[PDB]
Structure formats: C-alpha cells, structure tokens
Amino acid sequence: QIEQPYRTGYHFQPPSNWMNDPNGPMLYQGVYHFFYQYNPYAATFGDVIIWGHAVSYDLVNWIHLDPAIYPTQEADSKSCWSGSATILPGNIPAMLYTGSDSKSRQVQDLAWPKNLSDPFLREWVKHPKNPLITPPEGVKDDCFRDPSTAWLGPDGVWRIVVGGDRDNNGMAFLYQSTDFVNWKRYDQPLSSADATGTWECPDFYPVPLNSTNGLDTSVYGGSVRHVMKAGFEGHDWYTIGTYSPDRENFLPQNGLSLTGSTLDLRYDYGQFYASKSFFDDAKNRRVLWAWVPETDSQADDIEKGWAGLQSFPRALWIDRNGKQLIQWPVEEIEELRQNQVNLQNKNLKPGSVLEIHGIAASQADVTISFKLEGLKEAEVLDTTLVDPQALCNERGASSRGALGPFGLLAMASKDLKEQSAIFFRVFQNQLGRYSVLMCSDLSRSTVRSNIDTTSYGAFVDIDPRSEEISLRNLIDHSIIESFGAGGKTCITSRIYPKFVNNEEAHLFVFNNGTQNVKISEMSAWSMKNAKFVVDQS
Numbered sequence: 001q002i003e004q005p006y007r008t009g010y011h012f013q014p015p016s017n018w019m020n021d022p023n024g025p026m027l028y029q030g031v032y033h034f035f036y037q038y039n040p041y042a043a044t045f046g047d048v049i050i051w052g053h054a055v056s057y058d059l060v061n062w063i064h065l066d067p068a069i070y071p072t073q074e075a076d077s078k079s080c081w082s083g084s085a086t087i088l089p090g091n092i093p094a095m096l097y098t099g100s101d102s103k104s105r106q107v108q109d110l111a112w113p114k115n116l117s118d119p120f121l122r123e124w125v126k127h128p129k130n131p132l133i134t135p136p137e138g139v140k141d142d143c144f145r146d147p148s149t150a151w152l153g154p155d156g157v158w159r160i161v162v163g164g165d166r167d168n169n170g171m172a173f174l175y176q177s178t179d180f181v182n183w184k185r186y187d188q189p190l191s192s193a194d195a196t197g198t199w200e201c202p203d204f205y206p207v208p209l210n211s212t213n214g215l216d217t218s219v220y221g222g223s224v225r226h227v228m229k230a231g232f233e234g235h236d237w238y239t240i241g242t243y244s245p246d247r248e249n250f251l252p253q254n255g256l257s258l259t260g261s262t263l264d265l266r267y268d269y270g271q272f273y274a275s276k277s278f279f280d281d282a283k284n285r286r287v288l289w290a291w292v293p294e295t296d297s298q299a300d301d302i303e304k305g306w307a308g309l310q311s312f313p314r315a316l317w318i319d320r321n322g323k324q325l326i327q328w329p330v331e332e333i334e335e336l337r338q339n340q341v342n343l344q345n346k347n348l349k350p351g352s353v354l355e356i357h358g359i360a361a362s363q364a365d366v367t368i369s370f371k372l373e374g375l376k377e378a379e380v381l382d383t384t385l386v387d388p389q390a391l392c393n394e395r396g397a398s399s400r401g402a403l404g405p406f407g408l409l410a411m412a413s414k415d416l417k418e419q420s421a422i423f424f425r426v427f428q429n430q431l432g433r434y435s436v437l438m439c440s441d442l443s444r445s446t447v448r449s450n451i452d453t454t455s456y457g458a459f460v461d462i463d464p465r466s467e468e469i470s471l472r473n474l475i476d477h478s479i480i481e482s483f484g485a486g487g488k489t490c491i492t493s494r495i496y497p498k499f500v501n502n503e504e505a506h507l508f509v510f511n512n513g514t515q516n517v518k519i520s521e522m523s524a525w526s527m528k529n530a531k532f533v534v535d536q537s
C-alpha cells in the first residue's frame with residue numbers, strides 16, 4: 001500500500017487542504033512569489049478563503065510560508081479572493097484582490113508588503129481606504145471580481161481590468177489611476193461578450209511578434225499584439241488583438257467576440273482554470289500559472305485530505321504565424337531529469353504496443369516525434385465545424401482509424417486494464433487538405449467509480465506533409481500535461497487509476513491505426529521530486 005499515490009512529485013500544491021486560483025504571481029528581488037486561493041480548514045471550497053504563499057528561486061523548488069493575505073478589515077472580512085501583483089516604480093509590489101466584505105459584496109482591495117527588507121515578503125499591510133473599487137452601477141454585488149496586473153500607459157496613467165458581467169454579458173471592466181489608490185472606471189469595458197456569464201480572472205498583456213520572449217505588461221507598439229484572456233463557462237479563453245491606449249480600444253485580430261465555442265482559442269483544452277501570467281524580467285519571459293481542479297469526488301478529496309494542483313509553470317509567447325499562443329514548461333524543469341531512455345527510427349506496426357522500460361513511469365518527462373507514411377490514406381472527414389472534444393469522446397484509443405490512434409499510454413497498469421491514452425489522428429477533407437486531432441482519452445484511465453473520466457481533444461495547426469507530429473508529456477501521478485506540436489496544443493488531464501495504490505505504473509507507445517507510423521525519435525526522463533520546504537508558524 002503506497003501512501004498518497006495521487007500527490008504529485010514536482011507540481012505545486014500545499015501540504016494539504018484545498019487550493020484553487022493562482023494569485024499575485026511575480027518575481028521580486030530575485031525571488032519568485034506564488035500565492036493561491038486556499039482554505040485553511042478543509043479539502044473543499046469554504047466560507048473562509050485566504051491567500052496561501054510560497055517562494056522559490058527557480059519556480060520548481062518551493063518554500064511554503066504562512067498565508068500572506070487573510071481577512072483583517074471590513075473590506076475583506078468574509079474572504080480574500082483572487083487578485084494580481086503589480087510592481088510599481090520605486091520597486092514596491094502592490095497587490096489588488098477581490099475581498100468579500102461584511103455585506104457579502106465583491107470589492108477590490110489593495111495591499112503591499114510591510115517589510116521590503118524581507119526577501120520572502122511574509123507580512124502585508126492593507127490600504128486604510130479599502131475598498132478602492134466597488135461594483136459599477138448596474139452590476140450585481142457578486143459579479144465583480146479578480147483584478148488583473150496593471151499596466152502604465154505612456155501618459156503615466158495605470159490601467160487594470162476587473163471581471164464581471166452586466167446582465168449575463170461578460171465584461172472586462174477597465175479602471176484608471178495615477179496614484180494606484182484612486183481609481184475611476186472608464187466609460188466602456190476593455191472588452192466583453194454577450195451571454196457568457198461573469199468573466200473570471202481576466203488577464204491582459206502584450207506579446208512580441210516574431211519572438212519567443214515575454215514583455216513587461218506596459219509595453220506597446222506596432223511590433224506588439226495584446227492578449228485578452230478571461231474565464232467563463234468553465235474554461236479559460238483568450239483572443240489576440242491590437243490595443244490602443246489612447247481610446248482604450250482592443251480590437252480582436254479575428255474580429256470576433258468570445259462565444260466560448262470551437263470558434264475560440266484556449267490555453268489548454270483539458271482541466272485548466274483561473275490561469276494568470278506574470279512577466280519575468282530575469283529571463284525575459286512571460287510565465288503562466290493555472291489551477292488544475294480535481295476530477296475525483298468531493299468525498300474522495302475530504303478522504304485524501306487535499307484538493308487542487310497548479311499546472312507546471314509554462315513560458316508563453318506568440319506563434320510565428322501570429323494567430324495563436326505557444327506554451328512550454330519553463331526550462332528549469334529540465335534540472336529534475338535523471339536517467340534517460342531513448343528510441344530512434346522505430347516502426348510501430350498497426351495495432352502494436354511498445355513498452356518503455358527503465359523509466360519512473362509515474363513521474364516522467366516524455367517526448368516523442370512521429371514520421372507518417374501514406375498520408376493519402378487518411379480517413380476523409382471535413383472538420384470545419386467538428387467539435388474535437390466530442391470526436392475524442394466518441395473515438396477513443398479503441399476506435400481504430402487509418403492514421404491514428406497513435407501516441408502514448410501513460411499512468412497505465414501492466415495489464416493495460418487502466419490507461420490514459422494521449423494520441424493523434426490524421427484526417428483529410430474532400431479537397432485533400434489534412435487536419436490533425438490531438439486527444440487525451442481518459443475513458444479507461446481508472447476502474448474507479450465517481451471519477452470524471454471525460455476525454456479532451458483539440459485540432460493541431462500543423463501541416464502533416466512537411467512536419468512530423470510531436471508530443472511532450474509531463475507525467476506526475478494524478479496529473480498529465482500534454483503538449484502537441486511544440487506547445488501549439490496543450491491538454492491537461494487529471495487521472496486516478498486504482499492500481500497506483502499497490503503496483504507501479506507503466507509507460508507505452510502505441511499505434512492502433514491500420515496504417516504504419518514511425519517513431520523518428522523518443523526521449524524519456526525519470527523526474528526526481530521537486531523540494532518543498534515548510535517555513536511556517
């Protein structure tokens with residue numbers, strides 16, 4: 001009997017209890033700070049939520065500290081909900097977050113460290129005039145929250161967006177300020193969308209064109225595009241566009257308003273929510289954090305004593321084509337790599353399963369690249385309006401095609417009674433144009449009852465004719481993060497196989513299609529544990 005088989009070895013999570021939204025991520029004086037919605041009293045959401053706090057020098061190894069922000073004033077007496085960090089000139093980190101006041105309404109509060117001499121910024125002081133911002137005229141008391149990191153315009157005026165909705169229409173309410181204390185709502189929202197519901201944890205930032213670097217939030221210009229991100233209808237959506245400080249205008253590149261449909265982009269197509277990014281000027285990259293909810297039952301959570309994980313932090317940038325974002329785990333993760341097992345020029349015949357020996361199958365970093373033959377044999381299927389997730393749930397690893405399913409079997413039992421299959425399928429429309437589907441088939445990830453085993457999928461924007469299909473998987477016990485085509489398509493999965501309680505996991509490569517596929521190259525590394533030190537009480 002293995003203890004806590006579902007706890008991860010290198011993903012961030014508190015010692016125990018419930019954790020959701022990542023809060024105020026930032027880099028300050030050489031230290032990476034991470035905060036998060038935390039329930040000090042249970043492994044479920046609760047009436048009292050506070051900001052947990054941890055610090056790190058590399059985003060991999062962490063030191064758990066005492067919570068940083070917890071109810072101490074009327075403006076946040078019932079709870080301290082999500083917010084973001086902005087480092088103001090003069091080198092002072094300012095935290096804006098949504099507090100639940102004594103009247104149970106959502107208001108925006110300000111706090112900043114009380115002891116800048118402390119490398120870990122443990123103590124925080126709250127502004128005497130909180131709340132700084134209260135719900136606009138026609139907005140309900142519980143539909144106004146999650147202030148973003150602020151950006152300073154060329155006119156010396158600060159901007160921030162706060163999420164909410166006006167009559168069920170998602171809103172990114174824009175506020176302005178020069179002293180960061182007195183804020184005035186701009187006449188029009190920065191962006192919005194009809195019937196989406198409250199926009200949660202909005203994020204607004206620039207990305208450099210033709211570059212894999214990150215930018216400080218306040219950069220603007222012609223060689224820069226902006227990303228408007230918001231969570232609603234259960235997922236995190238984003239759209240790339242152009243921002244004009246002058247008129248506070250955000251113009252979507254594709255001219256669409258978010259609808260939460262297969263028409264819009266997401267950072268990740270699996271369990272991924274309340275994502276928040278920050279600029280890291282030490283490495284000149286933008287890092288993205290995201291809450292990964294549990295998919296087991298609440299009773300299971302209370303039983304194991306904890307709930308919620310954070311995705312492994314990923315660098316973020318805009319693709320060469322400028323039509324979507326690219327994500328990739330921060331390079332620091334590579335330091336966890338131990339022994340390596342590699343394969344090259346290996347054919348995977350139809351219906352075959354190849355086991356990868358010598359790897360810690362429950363805690364690994366696996367990359368594989370497939371070279372295809374006989375593309376003309378791809379099943380004919382126009383995918384213009386097809387819902388990729390629906391398609392993966394309809395056709396799992398057991399549904400045999402021509403090109404596909406071929407990919408990986410992770411967190412699998414020796415007898416394959418339980419397995420999580422991450423794979424691809426290749427289709428072509430009537431005109432001979434190819435499309436690529438990436439799937440995380442979780443239908444057989446566990447034999448346990450009361451586990452949400454819904455599968456996830458998304459189309460990958462690559463040309464199978466000229467580029468091999470690559471896949472990287474971060475396997476860490478109850479979480480699997482899959483990156484297709486170098487980060488073009490990401491899918492995070494939560495799995496709870498029963499076998500992990502008594503036996504070891506296995507890793508396989510497979511091809512259940514009728515066409516042959518070749519592994520041009522595969523690299524697998526056992527990953528050692530990240531260190532988590534407690535410096536509390």
Ligand SMILES: *[C@H]1O[C@H](CO)[C@@H](O[C@@H]2O[C@H](CO)[C@@H](O[C@H]3O[C@H](CO)[C@@H](O)[C@H](O)[C@@H]3O)[C@H](O)[C@H]2NC(C)=O)[C@H](O)[C@H]1NC(C)=O
Nearest residue numbers: 351352353396397398399400409416419421444510511512
């Ligand atoms: C992909 O290749 C096979 C394509 O179907 C798939 O076969 C599995 O095993 C048999 C077919 O050989 C079938 O199992 C059926 O019978 C069992 C009896 O216990 C039922 O429980 C199943 O639901 C099903 O009716 C299925 O076709 C399939 N079984 C399943 C779903 O596990 C292979 O499993 C596939 N290979 C991989 C690596 O996924």
Ligand SMILES: *[C@@H]1O[C@H](CO)[C@@H](O[C@@H]2O[C@H](CO)[C@@H](O)[C@H](O)[C@H]2NC(C)=O)[C@H](O)[C@H]1NC(C)=O
Nearest residue numbers: 113114115116117118119120121122123124125
């Ligand atoms: C402000 O932060 C500094 C830096 O952490 C604190 O100073 C340290 O305090 C501990 C405990 O008293 C000592 O063991 C260290 O030697 C101190 N180091 C430094 C840099 O002086 C300081 O105590 C904090 N101030 C307050 C009000 O708590």
